[PDB]
């Protein structure tokens, strides 16, 4: 997260780290047995780490659980990153409490101008590299489709929205992919892609979760 702040240990209790020997993507716990993340985060051998703040220190609130199965969206296109979403089932149910909580799926889509919280352990520098060990947070508005599509011509589909600041300075970044965009208590976005991080006129692009609720609910119930 570039230009964000330290969340505070376990203030984002639905945030997940996906680990395959090291943190490589975030995710969101949507109930005790299921995580949603980005399909471009797919790997074989995922361990889901819940209750994390510093990902390099065991501070006592963590639950480390292996993934039993991963389901990438049936129409995921890795070239356009259209339908960038995947579900990950846990081998055993998470114990929910104040530090490990699930996030709600949306009943409808959020409008332009709604303020959202975006969180992750990704790169904190735009020109350069610096990786945080504690969770970073950023409040950002959903931008209008016109300014999202003018920023990326011919690349935004109906399944994507932009969030952030066109002056730049504040954005999601690599290492944040798969992570949550929560607006009004609902999971509305997934960190998907962007051009670099925090550049002017290059906002982040997020998977629009309100278009996938039927697919998520049908898939978790049959698996
Ligand atoms: N090797 C992998 N499995 C992998 C996983 C995640 C990646 N994510 C990227 C990656 O390219 C990437 N993730 C981004 C997220 C946000 C922004 C942004 N500016 N909002 C830019 C990003 N660029 N490459 C990736 C590669
Ligand atoms: Ca830890």
Do both 124 and 80 map to the same domain?
no
Question: Residue 32 is encoded by which pair of tokens?
Answer: 């005790």
The bound ligand whose nearest atom lies closest to the alpha carbon of 204 is 1
Run of H or E residues at 216: helix 213-221
Question: CB of 40 closer than 6 A to ligand 1?
Answer: yes
On whether the CB atoms of residues 70 and 42 are closer than 8 A, the answer is yes
Give the integer Cα–Cα distance in Å for 127 and 141: 23
Going edge to edge, which strands form the sheet with 115-120?
5-6, 136-141, 115-120, 180-183, 186-193, 204-208, 160-163
Q: Which atom, in ligand 1's list, is nearest to the CA of 202?
A: 19
Among 177, 178, 190, 197, residue to substitute to test ligand 1 (most atoms within 8 Å of Cβ): 177
Gyration radius of the chain's alpha carbons: 16
Give the integer Cα–Cα distance in Å for 60 and 51: 9
Concerning whether 84 is annotated as a catalytic residue, the answer is: yes
For 193, how many CA atoms within 13 A lie in the half-sphere containing its CB?
19
Question: CB of 84 closer than 6 A to ligand 1?
Answer: no
Domain total for the chain? Answer: 2
Strands 186-193 and 136-141: unpaired
Q: Which residues have a Cβ under 8 Å from the Cβ of 34 and sit 6 or more positions away?
A: 87, 88, 89, 90, 220
Domain that holds residue 38: 13-102+211-223
Give the integer Cα–Cα distance in Å for 48 and 46: 6
Question: Residue 134 is encoded by which pair of tokens?
Answer: 């504690």
Give the integer Cα–Cα distance in Å for 4 and 211: 28
CA-closest candidate to residue 219, choices 51, 74, 5, 39: 74
On whether the CB atoms of residues 197 and 205 are closer than 8 A, the answer is no
Q: Measured on CA atoms in the order 113, 170, 161, 40, is the torsion positive or negative?
A: negative
Do both 7 and 109 map to the same domain?
yes
Do both 129 and 47 map to the same domain?
no
CA distances from 50 to 70, 93, 195, 208 (A): 17, 11, 29, 24
This structure was determined by X-ray
Strands 186-193 and 180-183: antiparallel
Do both 38 and 5 map to the same domain?
no
CA-closest candidate to residue 183, choices 138, 213, 121, 148: 138
Give the integer Cα–Cα distance in Å for 16 and 195: 24
Catalytic position from the list 17, 40, 73, 192: 40
Residue 190, judged by CB atoms within 10 A of its CB (0-12, 13-18, 19+), counts as buried
What's 137's domain CATH number? 2.40.10.10
Concerning whether 177 is annotated as a catalytic residue, the answer is: yes
> What is the distance, to the nearest Å, from the Cα of residue 204 to the centroid of all Cα atoms in its chain?
12
Catalytic position from the list 17, 23, 37, 84: 84
The DSSP 8-state label assigned to residue 151 in this structure reads H
CA-closest candidate to residue 20, choices 41, 50, 1: 41
Concerning whether 23 is annotated as a catalytic residue, the answer is: no
Q: Is residue 100 marked as binding?
A: no
Distance (Å) from CA 222 to ligand 1 centroid: 30
> What is the distance, to the nearest Å, from the Cα of residue 74 to the centroid of all Cα atoms in its chain?
19
Do both 27 and 89 map to the same domain?
yes
Give the integer Cα–Cα distance in Å for 160 and 22: 28
Bridge partner list, 137: 5, 119
Do both 47 and 7 map to the same domain?
no
- Using DSSP, how many helices (H) and how many strands (E) does the chain show? 2, 13
Among 37, 170, 171, 174, residue to substitute to test ligand 1 (most atoms within 8 Å of Cβ): 174
Do both 217 and 150 map to the same domain?
no
The bound ligand whose nearest atom lies closest to the alpha carbon of 9 is 2
């Amino acid at each position: 997260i570039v230009g964000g702040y330290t969340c505070g240990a376990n203030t984002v209790p639905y945030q997940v780290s996906l680990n395959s020997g090291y943190h490589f993507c975030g995710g969101s716990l949507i109930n005790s047995q299921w995580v949603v993340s980005a399909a471009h985060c797919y790997k074989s051998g995922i361990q889901v780490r819940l209750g994390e703040d510093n990902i390099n220190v065991v501070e006592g609130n963590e639950q480390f659980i292996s993934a039993s199965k991963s389901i990438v969206h049936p129409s995921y296109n890795s070239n356009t990153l259209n339908n960038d979403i995947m579900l990950i089932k846990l081998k055993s149910a998470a114990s929910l409490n104040s530090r490990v909580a699930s996030i709600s799926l949306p009943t409808s889509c959020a409008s332009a101008g709604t303020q959202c919280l975006i969180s992750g352990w990704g790169n904190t520098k735009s020109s350069g590299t610096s990786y945080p060990d504690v969770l970073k947070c950023l409040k950002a508005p959903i931008l209008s489709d016109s300014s999202c599509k003018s920023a990326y011509p011919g690349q935004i589909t109906s399944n994507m929205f932009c969030a952030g600041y066109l002056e730049g300075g504040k954005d999601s970044c690599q290492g944040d992919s798969g992570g949550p965009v929560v607006c009004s208590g609902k999971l509305q976005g997934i960190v998907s892609w962007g051009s670099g991080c925090a550049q002017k006129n290059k906002p982040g692009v997020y998977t629009k979760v309100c278009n996938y609720v039927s697919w998520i609910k049908q898939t978790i119930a049959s698996n």
